[PDB]
Design a binder for this molecule. Structure first.
Ligand SMILES: *[C@@H]1O[C@H](CO)[C@@H](O[C@@H]2O[C@H](CO)[C@@H](O[C@@H]3O[C@H](CO)[C@@H](O)[C@H](O[C@H]4O[C@H](CO)[C@@H](O)[C@H](O)[C@@H]4O[C@H]4O[C@H](CO)[C@@H](O)[C@H](O)[C@@H]4O)[C@@H]3O)[C@H](O)[C@H]2NC(C)=O)[C@H](O)[C@H]1NC(C)=O
Ligand SMILES: *[C@@H]1O[C@H](CO)[C@@H](O[C@@H]2O[C@H](CO)[C@@H](O)[C@H](O)[C@H]2NC(C)=O)[C@H](O)[C@H]1NC(C)=O
Ligand SMILES: *[C@@H]1O[C@H](CO)[C@@H](O[C@@H]2O[C@H](CO)[C@@H](O)[C@H](O)[C@H]2NC(C)=O)[C@H](O)[C@H]1NC(C)=O
Ligand SMILES: *[C@@H]1O[C@H](CO)[C@@H](O[C@@H]2O[C@H](CO)[C@@H](O)[C@H](O)[C@H]2NC(C)=O)[C@H](O)[C@H]1NC(C)=O
Ligand SMILES: *[C@@H]1O[C@H](CO)[C@@H](O[C@@H]2O[C@H](CO)[C@@H](O)[C@H](O)[C@H]2NC(C)=O)[C@H](O)[C@H]1NC(C)=O
Ligand SMILES: *[C@@H]1O[C@H](CO)[C@@H](O[C@@H]2O[C@H](CO)[C@@H](O)[C@H](O)[C@H]2NC(C)=O)[C@H](O)[C@H]1NC(C)=O
Ligand SMILES: *[C@@H]1O[C@H](CO)[C@@H](O[C@@H]2O[C@H](CO)[C@@H](O)[C@H](O)[C@H]2NC(C)=O)[C@H](O)[C@H]1NC(C)=O
Ligand SMILES: *[C@@H]1O[C@H](CO)[C@@H](O[C@@H]2O[C@H](CO)[C@@H](O)[C@H](O)[C@H]2NC(C)=O)[C@H](O)[C@H]1NC(C)=O
Ligand SMILES: *[C@@H]1O[C@H](CO)[C@@H](O[C@@H]2O[C@H](CO)[C@@H](O)[C@H](O)[C@H]2NC(C)=O)[C@H](O)[C@H]1NC(C)=O
Ligand SMILES: *[C@@H]1O[C@H](CO)[C@@H](O[C@@H]2O[C@H](CO)[C@@H](O)[C@H](O)[C@H]2NC(C)=O)[C@H](O)[C@H]1NC(C)=O
Ligand code: NAG
Ligand code: NAG
Ligand code: NAG
Ligand code: NAG
Ligand code: NAG
Ligand code: NAG
Ligand code: NAG
Ligand code: NAG
Ligand code: NAG
Ligand code: NAG
Lengths: 441, 48, 48
C-alpha cells in the first residue's frame, strides 16, 4: 500500500573521490605564471555545515599533480637556454689562495681552459673560478657532470623566486578544504568547506627545513602516514616561524665569454676583497624553544618519559645530508649540525652559525643525466627566511632502549608539497540521483 | 588469394595460408658488444 | 675515415670479406681529446 515511484533529481549535492587535472591561477620567472588564469579578486569559500569528510594527505593526487607540474615548468624554463657542451674540456686548475680564510682551504679553483669562439676556426684561452664540488681531477680537472650528461646554463633573466600558485579544479569538480585546526592530515574532518582553489602555495625547494610555508594556527603539528613505522618521514609544522639569515658574502664578479654565435657563458672572474665561507644564522633561543615544542608534541606519540634526541643526518648525497636550498640564484648546501644536536629528558643574543657550501652544477630533482648550471650572481647576496617545519626521520625503533632519535631528512620534494596540500582534496560532483516519491508521471 | 585486380600484373597478390610454415632464423656468431663514450652521456655500441 | 681490414680469423668460405675490422678516431667526453677505437662493421654498412 505504498505506491512509490522512482523520481529523478538533477543538481543533487553529492560528490565522489576523484582524480582530475587542476589548472593554475595566480595574481621572467621559472614558475611560468604567464600561462595561468587570473585569480579572482574576492575568492569565494562555501562553508559546508553538518558535513564530515574523510581526508588523507598521504594519498592525495594533488601532490603528484603538483610534482609533475613543477618538474614540467622547470624543464620548460630551461629549454630556451644555452647548452654548455663546449664546457667539457680539460681544465688547468690552481688553488685560489688570495685573501682566503682557514675555512676556505682549496674550496675555490682558478681554472684556465681553451674555449670555442663565434668563429668555428678560432679558440680563446679563458679562465673561471669554480667550486671544489663542481670539478673533479682527471692539476688537470673536468666538470663533475661531463661523464653523465651536458649541462644547460640557466638563462640569467629568469628568476628562481617562488611565486604563490593556486590549483583550481575544472567544471564538475570541487576542492574540499578541511578547516579543522589540530587536524593531523588523516581521518574524518568535521569542519569542511568548498573552495574554487587553495591559498597561494609557493613552490619552495628545500631539504631538512620547510621554508616560507604555512604555520599551524594552534600549536606544533606532527604528521606521519604511520608514526610507528620509522621508514615514514615525519612532517613537523611550526606555529612560530624561526628566522634564518643566509648569506654569501663574496663580492663575486660575473664575466661573459662568447662561446658561439649568440651563446654566452657566464664565468666567475674574481672575488673583490676577502674570500670567506657563506653561512646561515639561526637564533639559538628560538630554535631551543621550537625544539622544546616539537619534543613535547612528539612525547604524545612516543611516550611521556622517553628521551628525545636530535642528531645529524645519517648519510647520502649532499642534497639530503645538508639543508639544500636556493638563495637569490645561488644554491646553498648548509651543514645543519648545530641545529639537530641535543638530548631532551622528561622532567641571549648569539645565534647558531651553520656553514654552507655553494654549488653551480645542480641536479634539482632526483634525476640522473639532467643537470643545470647556475650562472654566478653579481655581488654579495643575503636572504632571510622563515623555518616553518621539519622533515624528520626516526632512527632505529627497537624496544630494548627508551630513547628516540630523530634526524633531518628530505630529498623527495613531494613531502614539501604535502605539507601545504594536507588540508585539501578533490572530488567530482554527482548531480544525478533517484529517490522514492508518491508522485506518478 | 586476394588482389585488387587479379588480371592486372602490376597489382600485388596477397596469399594467406591456412597451415603456417615454421621458419627458424639464426645468427650463430657470438657477438661481443663494447661501449665507447662518444660524448657527455653519449655511448656508441660497437661490435668488439 | 675508417681504416678497414678483412676479418679473416675463423671465417667460413661463405663469409669472405663480409666483416670489416675498422679502426677510427673518435670524440670523447672531453671536447679536446680523441680516442682511437675499432669496430666490426658489415660489408653492406661501409663503402670505400
Ligand atoms: C623566503 O621569502 C623571502 C622574502 O620574500 C626571500 O628573501 C627575498 O629574496 C629575494 C630574492 O633572493 C630578494 O630579492 C632580491 O633583492 C636583491 C637586493 O635588493 C636584489 O638585488 C634582487 O634583484 C636582482 O635579482 C632579481 C632576480 O632575483 C632580478 O629580477 C633583478 O633585476 C636583480 O637582478 C640584477 O642584479 C643582479 C645582482 O647584481 C644581477 O645578477 C642581474 O643580472 C641584474 O643585473 C632581488 O630583487 C629579497 O630582497 C629577499 N627579501 C628578504 C627580506 O630577505 C627568501 O629568499 C625566501 N626563501 C626561499 C628559500 O625562497
Ligand atoms: C686566476 O688566474 C688568472 C690567470 O692565471 C689571474 O689573472 C691574472 O691576474 C694577474 C694579476 O694578479 C695579471 O697580471 C694577469 O695578467 C692575469 N692573467 C690573465 C690571463 O688574465 C687571476 O687573477 C686569478 N684569480 C684568482 C682569484 O686567483
Ligand atoms: C690550449 O691549447 C694550446 C694548444 O693546443 C695548449 O698549448 C699546448 O700545450 C701542450 C701541453 O698540454 C703542448 O704540448 C703544446 O706544445 C702546446 N701548444 C701551444 C701552441 O702552446 C694549451 O696548454 C691549452 N690550454 C689549456 C688551459 O688547456
Ligand atoms: C615570516 O613570518 C612572519 C610572522 O608569521 C610573517 O609576518 C607576517 O606577514 C603577514 C603577511 O602575509 C602579515 O599579515 C602578518 O601580520 C605578519 N606577522 C608578523 C608578526 O609580522 C612574515 O611575512 C614571514 N616571512 C616570510 C618570508 O614568510
Ligand atoms: C651571522 O652571525 C655572525 C656572528 O656569529 C655574524 O658575524 C658578524 O658580522 C658582523 C656584520 O654585521 C660583523 O660586524 C662582526 O664582526 C661579525 N662577527 C663575527 C664573529 O663573525 C654574521 O655577520 C652573521 N651573518 C648574517 C647573514 O646574519
Ligand atoms: C654529524 O656529526 C658527526 C660527528 O659529530 C660528523 O662526523 C664527522 O664527519 C667528518 C666528515 O666525514 C669527519 O671528518 C669527522 O671526523 C667526523 N667526526 C666524528 C666525531 O666522527 C658528521 O659528519 C656530522 N654529519 C653531517 C651530515 O655533517
Ligand atoms: C658539520 O659540522 C660539524 C661540526 O663542526 C663537523 O664535525 C667536525 O668535523 C671536523 C672534521 O673536519 C672535526 O675536526 C671536528 O671535530 C668535528 N666537530 C664535531 C663537533 O663533531 C662535520 O664534519 C660537518 N659536516 C661536514 C659534512 O663537513
Ligand atoms: C638449419 O639447418 C642446418 C642443416 O640443414 C643446421 O645445421 C646443423 O645444426 C646442428 C645444430 O643442432 C648441428 O649439430 C649439425 O652439425 C649442423 N649440420 C650442418 C650440415 O650444418 C642448422 O643448425 C639449422 N639452424 C637452425 C636455426 O635451425
Ligand atoms: C680488429 O683489430 C683490432 C686492432 O687492429 C684487434 O685488436 C688487437 O688484438 C690483438 C690480439 O690478436 C692484440 O694483441 C692487440 O693489442 C689488439 N689491438 C687493439 C688496438 O685492441 C682485434 O683483435 C681485431 N679483431 C678481429 C676480429 O680481427
Ligand atoms: C687518428 O688521427 C691521427 C692523427 O691525426 C692519425 O695519425 C696520422 O696519420 C697521418 C696519415 O693519415 C699521418 O700523416 C700523421 O703523421 C699521423 N699523425 C699521428 C700523430 O699519428 C691516425 O692515422 C688516425 N687514425 C685513424 C684510424 O684514422
Ligand atoms: C690545494 O689546497 C688543498 C687543501 O688546502 C690541497 O689538498 C691541495 O693539494 C692543494 N693543491 C695544490 C696546491 O695544487
Ligand atoms: C663519473 O665520474 C665520477 C667520478 O669520476 C664517478 O663517481 C661516477 O660514477 C661517474 N659516472 C659515470 C656515469 O661514469
Ligand atoms: C591522527 O592520526 C591518526 C592516524 O590513524 C588518526 O587515527 C587520528 O584520528 C588522527 N587524529 C585526529 C584528532 O583525528
Ligand atoms: C605501521 O608500521 C608497523 C611496522 O613498523 C606495522 O607493524 C603496522 O601494521 C603499520 N601500521 C599501519 C596502520 O599500516
Ligand atoms: C663589490 O665590488 C664592487 C666593485 O668594486 C663595488 O662597487 C661594490 O660596492 C662592492 N660591494 C660590496 C658589498 O663590497
Ligand atoms: C636576521 O636579520 C634581521 C634583520 O634583517 C635581524 O633583525 C635578525 O635578528 C637576524 N636574525 C638572526 C638569527 O641573525
Ligand atoms: C653538539 O653538542 C655537544 C654538547 O653535548 C657539543 O659538545 C658539540 O660541540 C655540539 N656540536 C655541534 C656541531 O654543535
Ligand atoms: C584490370 O586490369 C586490366 C588490365 O589493365 C584492365 O583491362 C581491367 O579493366 C582491370 N579491371 C578493373 C576492374 O579495373
Ligand atoms: C659466448 O661467449 C661468452 C663469453 O666467452 C660465453 O659466456 C657464452 O657461453 C658464449 N655463448 C655461446 C652460445 O657460445
Ligand atoms: C677482402 O676480401 C674480399 C673478398 O675476399 C676481397 O675482395 C678484398 O680485396 C679483400 N681486401 C683486402 C685483403 O684488403
Amino acid at each position: 500500500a505504498e505506491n512509490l515511484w522512482v523520481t529523478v533529481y538533477y543538481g543533487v549535492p553529492v560528490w565522489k573521490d576523484a582524480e582530475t587535472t587542476l589548472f593554475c591561477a595566480s595574481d621572467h620567472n621559472v614558475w611560468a605564471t604567464h600561462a595561468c588564469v587570473p585569480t579572482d579578486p574576492n575568492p569565494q569559500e562555501i562553508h559546508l555545515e553538518n558535513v564530515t569528510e574523510e581526508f588523507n594527505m598521504w594519498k592525495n593526487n594533488m601532490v603528484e599533480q603538483m610534482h609533475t607540474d613543477i618538474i614540467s615548468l622547470w624543464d620548460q624554463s630551461l629549454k630556451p637556454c644555452v647548452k654548455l657542451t663546449p664546457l667539457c674540456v680539460t681544465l688547468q686548475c690552481t688553488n685560489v689562495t688570495n685573501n682566503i680564510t682557514d675555512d676556505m682551504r682549496g674550496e675555490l679553483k682558478n681554472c684556465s681552459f681553451n674555449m670555442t669562439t663565434e668563429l668555428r676556426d678560432k679558440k680563446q684561452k679563458v679562465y673561471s673560478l669554480f667550486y671544489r664540488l663542481d670539478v673533479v681531477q682527471i692539476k688537470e680537472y673536468r666538470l663533475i657532470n661531463c661523464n653523465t650528461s651536458a649541462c644547460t646554463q640557466a638563462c640569467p633573466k629568469v628568476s628562481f623566486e617562488p611565486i604563490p600558485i593556486h590549483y583550481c579544479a575544472p567544471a564538475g569538480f570541487a576542492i574540499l578544504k578541511c578547516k579543522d585546526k589540530k587536524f593531523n592530515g588523516t581521518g574524518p574532518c568535521p569542519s569542511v568547506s568548498t573552495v574554487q582553489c587553495t591559498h597561494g602555495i609557493k613552490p619552495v625547494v628545500s631539504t631538512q627545513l620547510l621554508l616560507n610555508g604555512s604555520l599551524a594556527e594552534e600549536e606544533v603539528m606532527i604528521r606521519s602516514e604511520n608514526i610507528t613505522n620509522n621508514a615514514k618521514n615525519i612532517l613537523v609544522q611550526f606555529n612560530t616561524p624561526v628566522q634564518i639569515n643566509c648569506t654569501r658574502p663574496n663580492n663575486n664578479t660575473r664575466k661573459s665569454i662568447r662561446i658561439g654565435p649568440g651563446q654566452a657563458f657566464y664565468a666567475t672572474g674574481d672575488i673583490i676583497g676577502d674570500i670567506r665561507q657563506a653561512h646561515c644564522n639561526v637564533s639559538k633561543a628560538t630554535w631551543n624553544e621550537t625544539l622544546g615544542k616539537v619534543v613535547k608534541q612528539l612525547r604524545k606519540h612516543f611516550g611521556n618519559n622517553t628521551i628525545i634526541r636530535f642528531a645529524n643526518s645519517s648519510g647520502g648525497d649532499l642534497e639530503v645530508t645538508t639543508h639544500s636550498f636556493n638563495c637569490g640564484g645561488e644554491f646553498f648546501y648548509c651543514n645543519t649540525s648545530g641545529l639537530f644536536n641535543s638530548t631532551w629528558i622528561s622532567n641571549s643574543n648569539d645565534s647558531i652559525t651553520l656553514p654552507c657550501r655553494i654549488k653551480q652544477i645542480i641536479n634539482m630533482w632526483q634525476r640522473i643525466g639532467q643537470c643545470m648550471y647556475a650562472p654566478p650572481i653579481q655581488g654579495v647576496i643575503r636572504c632571510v627566511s622563515n623555518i616553518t617545519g621539519l622533515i624528520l626521520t626516526r632512527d632505529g625503533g627497537s624496544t630494548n632502549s627508551t630513547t628516540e632519535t630523530f634526524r633531518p631528512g628530505g630529498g623527495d620534494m613531494r613531502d614539501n608539497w604535502r605539507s601545504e596540500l594536507y588540508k585539501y582534496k578533490v572530488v567530482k560532483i554527482e548531480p544525478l540521483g533517484v529517490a522514492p516519491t508518491r508522485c506518478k508521471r
